[PDB]
Design a binder for this molecule. Structure first.
Ligand SMILES: [Zn+2]
Lengths: 289, 47, 55, 287, 317, 71, 338
């Protein structure tokens, strides 16, 4: 004579009564949907969830070690880092290069950006946080990469009109679901910012953004790295010294530099040469700006 | 119910009127016939 | 005291009786209860659902 | 090409098995099998009726397990039940007692052996507890559309078959779908055993226990019912004081639907318990 | 007889009224209802399936919904003062489908028509302009969106019925008078007027029928109703300045028997201003009220005496 | 007790006739998800049933019974 | 009755054929598929259903969000169905309209948008081997100018694989939600038409709009239909609310639509010679130099209102000596406010 029950809600907006029954439950007993149900017995039988070169070390390790290196975790009693911050001045192309490397992880990738979480109505931010934790936390381990976290991490003094503090209600609600929820061994939160103007000071935690790797201005070395990635497969003639064209790429993000590569892919048809030349990169630079 | 308030320095013109409103509501719901033996809160700041 | 009025979630209202097993403790109004499709019997009820500064 | 006047004999066995099967008649589709013996052409008698385990598919030809049916029927043949199957029954809750296409398809497939193929559908869910009148179903030949539908003699029992006179199912789906009459039978063993068993079911164990309970409760609990009864009596007499005015003015027509007489007669009937049990207390005190 | 009176079982007691959505070439159509129930069954007799124009209300049943049937549901040279404008609308909307020797050689075919308006309005002068089409054409005039707003919010489907009967009546001119869509629920008027604009522009049609839009003010049309609403020609109606009133009153006096003793100016400009509507009313009740005196002559006191009813009617309440 | 089957009829609806058809098949405006066009019973005439009025219509037979309103 | 006679006599087999094809469960559409046996379905009554696939329908013929027939008794899928609104029949682009012969004025941007719709589809091999991807497209906003003439040019100069264009009035319509299944069904028509080029004309025509433009970006910029067919928005107002922050990416080449010049109108007149036969004695440059600073739509209104006023004059041939009042009246009376 033990007490155990649950509240049911059908899709046709009809509420009934039934206790917690079924087979052996391990991940069940959570407030979810898409469960088993018969014609009129309304019993629970089956619960189902409803819904490249210069960096290869930090990305691949931080996602494989919390799943494959559990033996060293039990042998050493150490938790792995969770949040990585690919910050720094623009030009590196953290959006297209970080998303391309997330596609190179060979795991599941879920798109999540700034305007994705910010909705016209209120209360939907936590719905998309618990939804990103439905697919990520509930589904198979996926990869989620967000960008432009500094623009929404503004802490103003006059608390009378600021939407970025409601984005700090959803965002700091996620930090409540990371600092408050110790078992963060599942899908992590990968963030990145294009500027260090307004950085959130409350991101100092192992579960939060800990591995803050500083990527400086894309100098000849760094522009040769990200641009060697951008040109590691295409037909590159043995004349691209990358000096003048890598020097002229000032204040140009990876999307604008990819557009420079497209403009290089524009006039080479009528240039007569079937292979991309050296001066076509700087021609694209002086063509976009 | 054990609360841990934090980052109150940025929320602390009429910037003080809302602070007196919410705080006077805190007194209005903490000094009367309130269950003080069950509720608990910790406020934190930075400066 | 033996027979009262119930309000279903779907919107239509009904009236039920008292079962010989339960008592008048939970039978008082203001407490959400449960019913059965056959005879509208009652199996059981349904329950609804000081300061420190460290700076 | 010949037809007679058939009538399905229904005893208390199949009736009570359809009452317990109706109590266990969950909204899920159920299966059942009837047995009996064929003595002649135009009569059929059912004796053995059992239930079948439910399934997610419901009423279908695939749910009928031939090894389970033949196994249980063999276990009935080794015992004192030398009767062959005569039909199959089920329940149709909610959507009415009519038969869908699947039911007439499995009926067409199950009627290849028995020409009668008696079909009975019980539905005690929406049926009131006042009447338990049940109806039996039959299957008509598709080639009889040219000739008469039912050339059945003895048209007298059709008046007894007209009791289920719903204006949607009988002639709402009467095409290729008719019914048959139902009668009962009771021997002396069921009459005396069941009659004395029901009278005893409404009587006491020794039949002398709960008499003195009321005979002595007439002075403790019934007094409250007598005082309240007099409160209702006065509650009517307060208007009966106003009745001789209207009765002394109009004297034409009756406007109040209340009779004010049979209720007081019933109050006298409840009051006669003291008089009837006074002699009982006289017998208990005497000897 | 038996084969015709044997399908009564389908159209008998279990019968309903639904709304069909479309008909598929696979001989099974799709219907709908308040909750949108889609049932596809092979078609039967009594239906046309050609002129039905799927998307209207049809007949359903409580059965498997086999479709048993369907259930359907003053000339141009009389008035003066605007002879150039009435030969402009005459020459403009009498150009298609009439006088074809100067219509097919040009090869323009602007299937839009003119858009009329008038500060007096009332449909008398505008109907006197649109009367040029009544010479040789089928009578078809959808006067305003009154039937659109007085009926349930069915939307532009009635405009689709008037457009399909205007397609089956191609030798006609769809005239619209007293456009009170936005000048007088309320949110549906914008979508049925935007669908009236889209279907009126010729979204799935060509130069079949002309559309003449007349109203009380040209400014009542929204700026969206300009570029896809007026591409053919626009007009301009000046003030009557007692000349349109003089010609209309001359037509009213061309049939009745009355001398020049009746003052014209104070009666055509009695209250504020009026061309033909209430002076036509006092001409009707002047012929009837003058007929009450058993005299065909118009008395100088009976005409103004009957005029006191109209002068007092719109001024008291 | 003969009426007990009409109690088992699960009640009846309240029909409102809005337009009569000349084919002896008068449509009746009923509760939403209704609008059930049907011929009236044989013992009641059709011409007497005037439109724009409420009537009594059964839920299964769809038969009309009668018209409803200092000196 | 005559049509119902042969079918009424042919209605006998409808009783023996009434038992099959009875399956009708309001044609509920599926949502996704996590596993092959069990499929999640959602009916229009906001009731999500789940059932296993039948043996009569192959699993490879199931598409995400496809309206198919389904039983109401066995709950299985008996037979699918291919499905038509007016947008489907009008959406097809035929009758080759104004061609390239109107080359004049804005020649650089029309080349930048010509070498993105013509060259990539005609010459795909050297655009893939030459770099990373062929150009995506450009943006055409700002002044109308010679509107409805350059999209016509793209229709006429097609490689005979005609592309699909969509007007902006179809997006903001009554009963919102149809825009998602509309863009998905025209993307499905693009899949049927061997990756047909998708165009959205006049995008200038609030959650009901945010779903159409945010989901529209999630479809065009998304890689589900295709990421290399066509992206171009020729309109009067760009309505840069989401593009205002989504422009640094797949979309680029922010340019204007066109601009009017003095010597450009003679080409649009040279293609208006393809209309009703005008006397060739009248020079097109004489008709073009007397209307300074006139856009393509203004001279389109010259050749439209001059054609209505030409057919109004009740003549045989069109000569400027007859409707010259219509010409100077249509350039000046419309040049006052435009
Ligand atoms: Zn059933």
């Amino acid at each position: 004579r033990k007490g155990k029950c649950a509240v049911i809600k059908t899709s046709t907006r009809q509420t009934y009564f039934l206790p917690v029954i079924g087979l052996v439950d391990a991940e069940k007993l959570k407030p979810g949907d898409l469960v088993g149900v018969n014609k009129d017995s309304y019993l629970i039988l089956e619960t189902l969830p409803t819904e490249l070169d210069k960096q290869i070390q930090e990305l691949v390790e931080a996602i494989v070690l919390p799943m494959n290196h559990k033996e060293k975790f039990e042998n050493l009693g150490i938790q792995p880092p969770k949040g990585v911050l690919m910050y720094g001045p623009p030009g590196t192309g953290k959006t297209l290069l970080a998303r391309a490397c997330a596609a190179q992880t060979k795991a599941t990738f879920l798109k999540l950006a700034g305007p994705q979480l910010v909705q016209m109505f209120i209360g939907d931010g936590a719905k998309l946080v618990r939804d990103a934790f439905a697919l990520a936390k509930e589904k198979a381990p996926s990869i989620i990469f967000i960008d432009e976290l500094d623009a929404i991490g503004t802490k103003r003094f006059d608390s009378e009109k600021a939407g970025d503090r409601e984005v700090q209600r959803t965002m700091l609600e996620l930090l409540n679901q990371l600092d408050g929820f110790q078992p963060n061994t599942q899908v992590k939160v990968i963030a990145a910012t294009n500027r260090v103007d307004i950085l959130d000071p409350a991101l100092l935690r192992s579960g939060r953004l800990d591995r803050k790797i500083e990527f400086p201005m894309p100098n000849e070395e760094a522009r040769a790295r990200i641009m060697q990635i951008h040109s590691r497969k295409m037909n590159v003639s043995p004349d691209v010294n990358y000096e003048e064209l890598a020097r002229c790429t000032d204040d140009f993000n990876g999307a604008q530099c990819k557009a420079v590569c497209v403009e290089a892919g524009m006039i080479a048809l009528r240039r007569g040469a079937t292979e991309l030349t050296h001066e076509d990169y700087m021609e694209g630079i002086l063509e976009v700006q | 119910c054990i609360i841990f308030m934090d980052e109150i320095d940025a929320i602390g013109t009429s910037a003080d009127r809302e602070i007196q409103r919410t705080l006077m509501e805190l007194l209005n719901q903490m000094d009367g016939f309130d269950t003080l033996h069950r509720v608990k809160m910790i406020m934190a700041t930075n400066r | 005291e033996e027979k009262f009025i119930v309000k279903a979630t779907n919107g239509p209202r009904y009236v039920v009786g008292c079962r010989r097993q339960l008592d008048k403790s939970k039978l008082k109004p203001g407490t959400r209860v449960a019913l059965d499709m056959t005879t509208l019997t009652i199996m059981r009820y349904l329950p609804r659902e000081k300061g420190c500064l460290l700076y | 090409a010949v037809d007679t006047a058939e009538q399905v004999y229904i005893s208390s066995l199949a009736l009570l098995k359809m009452l317990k099967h109706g109590r266990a008649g969950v909204p899920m589709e159920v299966m059942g099998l009837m047995l009996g013996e064929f003595v002649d052409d135009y009569t059929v008698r059912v004796i053995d009726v059992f239930a079948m385990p439910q399934s997610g598919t419901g009423v279908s030809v695939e749910a009928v397990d031939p090894v389970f049916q033949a196994k249980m029927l063999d276990m009935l043949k080794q015992t004192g039940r030398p009767e062959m199957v005569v039909g199959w029954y089920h329940s149709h809750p909610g959507f009415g007692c009519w038969l869908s296409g699947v039911d007439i398809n499995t009926q067409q497939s199950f009627e290849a052996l028995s020409e009668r193929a008696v079909a009975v559908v019980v539905d005690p869910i929406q049926s009131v507890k006042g009447k338990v009148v049940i109806d039996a179903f039959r299957l008509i030949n598709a080639n009889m559309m040219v000739l008469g539908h039912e050339p059945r003699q003895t048209t007298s029992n059709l008046g007894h078959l007209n009791k289920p006179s719903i204006q949607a199912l009988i002639h709402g789906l009467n095409r290729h779908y008719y019914s048959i009459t139902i009668n009962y039978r009771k021997n002396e063993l069921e009459q005396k055993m069941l009659l004395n068993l029901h009278k005893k079911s409404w009587m006491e164990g020794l039949t002398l226990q709960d008499y003195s309970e009321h005979c002595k409760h007439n002075e403790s609990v019934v007094k409250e019912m007598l005082e309240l009864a007099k409160n209702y009596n006065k509650a009517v007499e307060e208007e009966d004081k106003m009745t001789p005015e209207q009765l002394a003015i109009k004297n034409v027509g009756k406007q109040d639907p209340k009779r004010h007489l049979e209720e007081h007669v019933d109050v006298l009937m409840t009051s006669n318990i003291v008089q009837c049990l006074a002699a009982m207390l006289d017998t208990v005190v005497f000897k | 007889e038996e084969e015709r009176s044997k399908v009564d079982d389908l159209r008998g007691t279990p019968m309903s009224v639904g709304t069909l959505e479309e008909i598929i070439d696979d001989n099974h159509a799709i219907v709908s209802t308040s909750v949108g129930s889609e049932h596809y069954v092979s078609i039967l007799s009594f239906v046309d399936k050609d002129l039905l124009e799927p998307g209207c209300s049809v007949l359903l049943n409580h059965k498997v919904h086999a479709v048993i049937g369907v259930l359907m549901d003053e000339t141009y040279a009389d008035i003066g003062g605007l002879d150039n404008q009435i030969q402009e609308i005459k020459e403009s909307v009498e150009l298609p489908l009439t006088h074809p020797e100067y219509y097919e050689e040009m090869g323009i075919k602007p299937p839009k028509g003119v858009i009329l308006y008038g500060p007096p309005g009332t449909g008398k002068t505008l109907l006197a302009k649109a009367v040029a089409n009544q010479t040789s054409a089928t009578f078809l005039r959808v006067v305003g969106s009154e039937l659109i707003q007085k009926y349930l919010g069915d939307g532009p489907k009635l405009v689709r019925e008037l457009f399909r009967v205007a397609e089956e009546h191609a030798p006609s001119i769809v005239f619209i008078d007293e456009i009170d869509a936005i000048g007088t629920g309320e949110r549906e008027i914008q979508r049925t007027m935007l669908e009236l604009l889209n279907q009126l522009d010729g979204f799935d049609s060509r130069g079949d029928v002309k559309v003449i839009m007349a109203t009380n003010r040209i400014e009542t049309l929204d700026p969206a109703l300009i570029r896809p609403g007026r591409i053919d020609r626009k007009i301009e109606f000046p003030l009557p300045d007692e000349k349109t009133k003089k010609r209309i009153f001359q037509i009213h006096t061309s049939r009745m028997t009355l001398a020049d003793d009746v003052t014209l100016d104070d009666l055509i400009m009695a209250k504020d201003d009026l061309s033909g509507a209430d002076i036509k009313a006092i001409c009707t009740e002047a012929g009837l009220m003058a007929l009450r005196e058993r005299r065909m002559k118009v008395t100088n006191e009976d005409f103004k005496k009957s005029k006191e009813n109209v002068l007092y009617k719109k001024q008291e309440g | 007790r003969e009426e007990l089957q009409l109690l088992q009829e699960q009640g009846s609806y309240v029909g409102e006739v809005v337009r009569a058809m000349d084919k002896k098949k008068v449509l009746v405006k009923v509760h939403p998800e209704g609008k059930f066009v049907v011929d009236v019973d044989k013992n009641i005439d059709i011409n007497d049933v005037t439109p724009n009025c409420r009537v009594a219509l059964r839920n299964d037979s769809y038969t009309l019974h009668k018209i409803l309103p200092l000196d | 009755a005559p049509p119902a006679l042969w079918d009424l006599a042919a209605d006998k087999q409808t009783l023996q054929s009434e038992q099959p094809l009875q399956v009708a469960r309001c044609t509920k559409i599926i949502n996704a598929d996590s596993e092959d046996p069990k499929y999640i379905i959602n009916v229009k009554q906001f009731a999500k259903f789940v059932v296993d696939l039948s043996d009569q329908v192959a699993p490879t013929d199931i598409e995400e969000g496809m309206r198919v027939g389904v039983d109401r008794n066995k709950y299985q899928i008996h037979i699918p169905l291919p499905p038509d609104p007016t947008v489907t029949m009008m959406q097809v682009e035929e009758k080759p309209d104004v061609t390239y012969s109107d080359v004049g004025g804005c020649k650089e941007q029309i080349e930048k948008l010509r070498e993105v719709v013509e060259t990539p589809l005609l010459h795909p091999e050297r655009f893939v081997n030459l770099g990373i991807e062929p150009p995506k497209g450009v943006l055409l906003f700002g002044p109308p100018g010679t509107g409805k003439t350059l999209c016509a040019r793209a229709v006429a100069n097609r490689t005979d694989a005609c592309f699909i264009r969509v007007i902006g009035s179809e997006l903001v319509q009554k009963y919102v939600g149809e825009g998602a299944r509309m863009v998905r069904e025209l993307f499905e028509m693009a899949r049927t038409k061997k990756a047909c080029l998708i165009f959205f004309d006049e995008i200038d025509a609030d959650n009901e709009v945010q779903r159409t433009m945010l989901e529209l970006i999630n479809q065009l910029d998304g890689f589900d239909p295709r990421g290399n067919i066509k992206v171009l928005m020729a309109t009067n107002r760009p309505d840069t609310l989401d593009p205002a922050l989504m422009r640094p990416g797949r979309l680029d080449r922010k340019i204007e639509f066109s601009l009017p010049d003095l010597e450009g109108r003679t080409h649009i007149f040279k293609i208006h010679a393809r209309s009703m036969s005008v006397e060739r004695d009248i020079r097109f440059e004489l008709l073009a130099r007397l209307c300074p600073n006139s856009t393509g739509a203004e001279i389109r209104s010259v050749c439209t209102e001059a054609g209505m006023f030409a057919i109004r004059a009740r003549r045989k041939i069109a000569t400027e000596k007859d409707f010259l009042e219509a010409v100077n009246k249509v350039i000046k009376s419309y040049a006052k406010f435009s």
